[PDB]
Amino acid sequence: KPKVSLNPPWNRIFKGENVTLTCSTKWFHNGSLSEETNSSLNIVNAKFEDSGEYKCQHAESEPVYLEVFSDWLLLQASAEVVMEGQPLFLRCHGWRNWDVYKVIYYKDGEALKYWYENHAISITNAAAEDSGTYYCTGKVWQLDYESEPLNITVIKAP
Amino acid sequence: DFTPPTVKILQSSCDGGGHFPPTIQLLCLVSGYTPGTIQITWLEDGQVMDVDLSTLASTQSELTLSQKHWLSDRTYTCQVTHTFEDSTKKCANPRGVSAYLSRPSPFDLFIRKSPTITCLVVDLAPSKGTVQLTWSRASGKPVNHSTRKEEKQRNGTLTVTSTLPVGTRDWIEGETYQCRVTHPHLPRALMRSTTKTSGPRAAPEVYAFATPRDKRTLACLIQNFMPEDISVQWLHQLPDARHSTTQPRKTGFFVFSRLEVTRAEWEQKFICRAVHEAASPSQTVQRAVS
Amino acid sequence: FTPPTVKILQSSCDGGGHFPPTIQLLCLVSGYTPGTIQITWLEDGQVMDVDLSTLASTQSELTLSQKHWLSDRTYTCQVTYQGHTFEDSTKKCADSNPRGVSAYLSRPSPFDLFIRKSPTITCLVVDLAPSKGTVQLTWSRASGKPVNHSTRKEEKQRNGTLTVTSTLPVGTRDWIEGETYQCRVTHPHLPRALMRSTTKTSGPRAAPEVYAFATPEWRDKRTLACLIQNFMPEDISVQWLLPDARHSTTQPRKTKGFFVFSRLEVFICRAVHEAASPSQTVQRAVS
Numbered sequence: 001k002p003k004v005s006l007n008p009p010w011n012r013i014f015k016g017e018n019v020t021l022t023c024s025t026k027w028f029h030n031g032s033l034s035e036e037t038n039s040s041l042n043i044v045n046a047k048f049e050d051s052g053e054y055k056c057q058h059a060e061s062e063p064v065y066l067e068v069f070s071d072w073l074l075l076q077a078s079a080e081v082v083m084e085g086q087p088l089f090l091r092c093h094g095w096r097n098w099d100v101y102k103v104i105y106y107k108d109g110e111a112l113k114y115w116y117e118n119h120a121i122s123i124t125n126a127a128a129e130d131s132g133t134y135y136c137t138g139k140v141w142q143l144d145y146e147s148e149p150l151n152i153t154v155i156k157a158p
Numbered sequence: 159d160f161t162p163p164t165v166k167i168l169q170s171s172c173d174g175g176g177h178f179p180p181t182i183q184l185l186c187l188v189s190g191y192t193p194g195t196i197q198i199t200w201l202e203d204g205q206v207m208d209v210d211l212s213t214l215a216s217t218q219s220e221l222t223l224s225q226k227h228w229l230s231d232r233t234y235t236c237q238v239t240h241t242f243e244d245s246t247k248k249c250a251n252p253r254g255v256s257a258y259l260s261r262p263s264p265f266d267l268f269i270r271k272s273p274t275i276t277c278l279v280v281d282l283a284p285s286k287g288t289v290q291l292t293w294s295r296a297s298g299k300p301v302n303h304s305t306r307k308e309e310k311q312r313n314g315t316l317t318v319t320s321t322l323p324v325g326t327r328d329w330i331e332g333e334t335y336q337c338r339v340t341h342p343h344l345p346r347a348l349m350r351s352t353t354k355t356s357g358p359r360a361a362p363e364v365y366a367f368a369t370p371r372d373k374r375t376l377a378c379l380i381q382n383f384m385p386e387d388i389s390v391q392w393l394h395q396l397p398d399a400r401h402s403t404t405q406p407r408k409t410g411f412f413v414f415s416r417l418e419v420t421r422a423e424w425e426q427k428f429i430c431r432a433v434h435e436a437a438s439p440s441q442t443v444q445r446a447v448s
Numbered sequence: 449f450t451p452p453t454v455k456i457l458q459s460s461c462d463g464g465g466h467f468p469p470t471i472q473l474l475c476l477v478s479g480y481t482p483g484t485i486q487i488t489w490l491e492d493g494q495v496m497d498v499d500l501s502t503l504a505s506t507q508s509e510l511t512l513s514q515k516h517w518l519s520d521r522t523y524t525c526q527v528t529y530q531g532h533t534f535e536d537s538t539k540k541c542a543d544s545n546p547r548g549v550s551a552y553l554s555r556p557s558p559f560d561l562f563i564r565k566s567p568t569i570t571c572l573v574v575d576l577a578p579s580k581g582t583v584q585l586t587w588s589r590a591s592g593k594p595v596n597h598s599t600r601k602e603e604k605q606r607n608g609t610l611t612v613t614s615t616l617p618v619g620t621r622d623w624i625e626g627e628t629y630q631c632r633v634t635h636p637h638l639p640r641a642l643m644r645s646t647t648k649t650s651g652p653r654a655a656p657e658v659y660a661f662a663t664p665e666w667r668d669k670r671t672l673a674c675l676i677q678n679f680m681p682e683d684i685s686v687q688w689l690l691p692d693a694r695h696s697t698t699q700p701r702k703t704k705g706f707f708v709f710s711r712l713e714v715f716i717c718r719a720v721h722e723a724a725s726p727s728q729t730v731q732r733a734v735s
C-alpha cells in the first residue's frame with residue numbers, strides 16, 4: 001500500500017492555491033477515478049470542488065483529505081495527528097500575497113507566541129502534551145482577524 | 159478678469175532625528191487671489207473645527223494640533239470659500255473595508271412610523287473594483303427597495319451606503335435584517351445583521367432645565383431607560399442640529415441634551431421630547447422649561 | 449540684538465498621507481533686530497545653498513526630490529545673525545509605529561494639576577514582543593532642565609505582548625510655563641527609538657460657567673446635574689464635594705464657538721480649569 005504526500009504539507013489551502021499529491025498509477029478524487037496516471041497528481045489554481053478524499057494505488061493505498069477555504073487567515077497545519085517525536089509544523093497563513101501582522105498563536109486558549117510580523121511553529125520533537133485546539137490571531141490591512149480553530153493530537157505509543 | 163486663490167498647507171517639520179513636535183502647526187497658504195472676501199473653514203476628517211473670514215492679495219490661516227491628535231491619522235482640510243481646498247495627514251499602508259449596520263430611530267419607528275436601517279461600507283479602494291451590496295430578511299420574505307448612495311471620501315477612500323426601508327410590524331415582531339457586502343478585493347463577503355433588541359425595557363424620565371451674556375441655554379436629563387435606543391428632540395419642531403446630545407451611559411442609561419436658543423426665542427416662549435420604545439402613551443415622555 | 453526664532457515648515461501630504469513629487473522646506477527666521485542675517489542650508493552636514501538678506505523676519509526655501517527626502521538625509525537651516533549661529537534641523541519623520549509598536553503619552557489632570565497640585569505625565573508603550581532587561585525608557589525636558597525620579601513597569605499582558613509603563617512627576621509651574629516633556633523608548637528590536645512629546649495645549653483660554661441642577665425622583669432618591677460650559681482648553685476637571693466615581697461626566701464637545709455635563713446621584717459642582725480665576729476654579733451649588 002502506497003501513501004499520499006502533500007507539497008506543501010498543508011491539507012488546508014486557499015482557493016486558487018496549488019498543491020501536489022505524490023504517491024503508471026491511478027488516482028481517486030472523492031471516489032471517482034481521476035484522469036491522471038503519473039505518480040504525482042497536479043493541482044493548479046484550486047477550486048472548492050478540489051476538496052474531498054483523495055487516494056492512489058498501483059495495492060490500493062488509504063485516503064488523504066483536502067479542504068479548500070476562501071478567507072483572510074487559514075491556520076494551516078503539517079499533520080492533524082502526529083506520533084511523539086515526529087515533526088509538526090504550524091503556520092498562520094494569509095489570503096494570497098497579503099501580509100498578516102501582529103500574529104499570535106493560541107493553543108487551547110493561551111497565548112502560545114506573539115511576534116510583530118508573521119511567524120510559524122516548528123517542533124522536531126512533537127511532545128505528546130502538544131495535543132490541543134489551536135488557532136491564530138492576525139492583522140490584515142490594519143484590520144483584525146481570528147483564524148478558524150484546528151484540533152491537533154499527538155500519540156505516544158509503547 | 160479675476161484669479162482664483164492658490165491653496166497649499168505647510169506643516170511643522172521634524173526633529174533632526176525625525177521625531178514629532180509636541181504640537182504640530184498647520185499653515186494654510188491662500189495666495190494669489192483677486193482682493194475680495196475670503197473665509198477659511200478648517201475640517202477635521204469632514205468636520206468643522208474652526209472658521210475665519212478675511213477682507214492680487216494673499217492670506218494665511220493656522221491650525222495647531224496635539225502630537226497625539228496628529229498621530230491619530232485624521233485628515234485635516236483647509237477649505238477656502240466658490241470652494242477651494244487642500245488636505246493633509248500624517249504621512250503614511252492600506253486599510254480594508256469596514257461595514258456598519260444601523261438600528262432604526264425610536265422616533266423614525268413610532269412617531270414618523272417610517273423605519274430605515276442603513277448599511278455603511280467604508281475604506282474601500284476606489285480602484286479595487288465595484289462593491290455589490292445586498293439585503294435579505296432572516297425569514298425569507300423579499301426586501302423592499304434599497305437606496306444606494308456613494309461618496310468618494312476626502313482621504314482617498316470609497317464610502318458606499320445603502321438605506322433599506324423596513325416595516326414597523328415586521329421589525330417589532332423580531333425580524334432580522336441582513337446586509338451583505340461583496341467585492342473583487344475581499345476573499346469573502348462582509349455581513350452585518352440587526353434585530354429588535356432583546357432584554358427588559360424601562361421607560362424614560364425627563365427634566366427640562368434652564369440657566370441664568372444674553373443668549374439662551376437649555377438642558378435636558380433623560381434617564382433610567384432600558385434599551386440604549388432612544389430619540390431626543392426639542393420642539394417649538396426645532397431642528398435636529400440646533401441641539402446637541404451625549405451618548406447613552408449606563409447609570410438604566412442616560413443622555414444630556416443641550417439646546418441654545420436666542421433670547422428672541424425667549425420672546426416667543428420649550429419642549430424636550432424623548433421618543434423611547436418603552437415610553438408610555440404614544441411611545442413618548444417629555445417635559446418643558448420656562 | 450534680539451535673537452531670531454528659527455523653524456522649518458514642510459510640504460504637507462496627500463489627503464491619504466502620500467508624498468509630494470517634490471518636498472519644499474521652508475525656513476522661517478522671525479522676530480529679530482533688523483540686521484544682516486544669512487541662511488546656510490546643510491544637507492547632512494554639507495552646504496547646499498546660501499542666502500543673505502539685509503523686529504523683522506525672513507524666509508529661505510529649499511526643495512527636494514521625493515526620493516532625496518525619503519533618503520532619510522538630515523537637512524539643517526543655519527541662520528548666522530549678528531555674529532552668532534542659530535539653527536533647526538529635520539529629516540523624513542521616522543516610522544512612528546515601528547514593527548507595530550505604539551507609545552502614548554498623557555497630559556496631566558486639571559485636577560491632578562491644580563487641586564492635588566501633584567502633576568504626572570505617563571508614557572505608555574504597548575504591543576511589544578516579550579523581552580527582559582532589553583527595554584529602556586528615558587525622560588527629558590525640552591528646556592534641557594534636569595530630570596530624575598521616574599517609574600518603570602515592564603509588565604506582561606494576556607495576549608502575549610509586553611506593555612511597559614513609566615510615570616514621570618512634573619512641576620505645575622514648569623508645565624504651566626509651556627515646558628515640553630519627551631519620552632524616549634529604545635529597544636534591540638526597534639531600528640530607532642520611539643519618541644513622544646507633550647506640552648501645555650496651545651490656543652486662547654476661557655474660564656468655565658457652572659450650573660447645579662436637580663429634579664427629585666421616584667426609596668425615592670434625587671438626581672443632580674451640572675453644565676460646565678464655554679471653556680477653551682478641552683482640559684477640564686469636574687468634581688462634587690464626594691468620590692470621583694459617585695458621579696459621571698460626558699466628554700467635552702465644542703459648543704457655539706466646549707462643554708461637559710455631570711450627573712451626580714445622591715451640594716457643590718467644582719470645575720478645575722486652567723483659565724478659571726482665582727484659585728483656578730469656578731463652581732456653584734444647588735439645593
Ligand SMILES: *[C@@H]1O[C@H](CO)[C@@H](O[C@@H]2O[C@H](CO)[C@@H](O[C@@H]3O[C@H](CO)[C@@H](O)[C@H](O[C@H]4O[C@H](CO)[C@@H](O)[C@H](O)[C@@H]4O)[C@@H]3O)[C@H](O)[C@H]2NC(C)=O)[C@H](O)[C@H]1NC(C)=O
Pocket residue numbers: 029030048049050051052053067068070
Ligand atoms: C468532492 O467531495 C467534496 C466533499 O467531500 C466536495 O467538497 C465540497 O465542495 C463544495 C463546493 O462544490 C463546498 O461547498 C462550498 O462551501 C463554501 C463555504 O464557504 C461556499 O462558499 C461555496 O459556494 C461558493 O461557490 C459557489 C459556486 O461555486 C459560488 O456561487 C458562491 O458565491 C460561493 O463562493 C460552496 O457552497 C463544500 O464545502 C465542500 N465540502 C467539503 C467536505 O469540503 C467537492 O466539491 C467534491 N469534488 C468533486 C470534484 O466531486
Ligand SMILES: *[C@@H]1O[C@H](CO)[C@@H](O)[C@H](O)[C@H]1NC(C)=O
Pocket residue numbers: 017018043044045
Ligand atoms: C500555481 O500553479 C500555476 C501553474 O503552475 C501558476 O500559475 C502559479 O504561479 C502557481 N502558484 C505558485 C506556485 O505560487
Ligand SMILES: *[C@@H]1O[C@H](CO)[C@@H](O)[C@H](O)[C@H]1NC(C)=O
Pocket residue numbers: 203204231232233253280281311312313314315
Ligand atoms: C476617511 O474618512 C472617513 C470619514 O470622513 C472615514 O470614515 C474613513 O475611515 C477614513 N479613512 C481613514 C481615516 O483611513
Ligand SMILES: *[C@@H]1O[C@H](CO)[C@@H](O)[C@H](O)[C@H]1NC(C)=O
Pocket residue numbers: 102574575605606607608609611
Ligand atoms: C494585548 O492585550 C493588552 C491587555 O489588554 C492590550 O493592552 C493590548 O492592546 C493588546 N495587544 C494587541 C493584540 O493589540
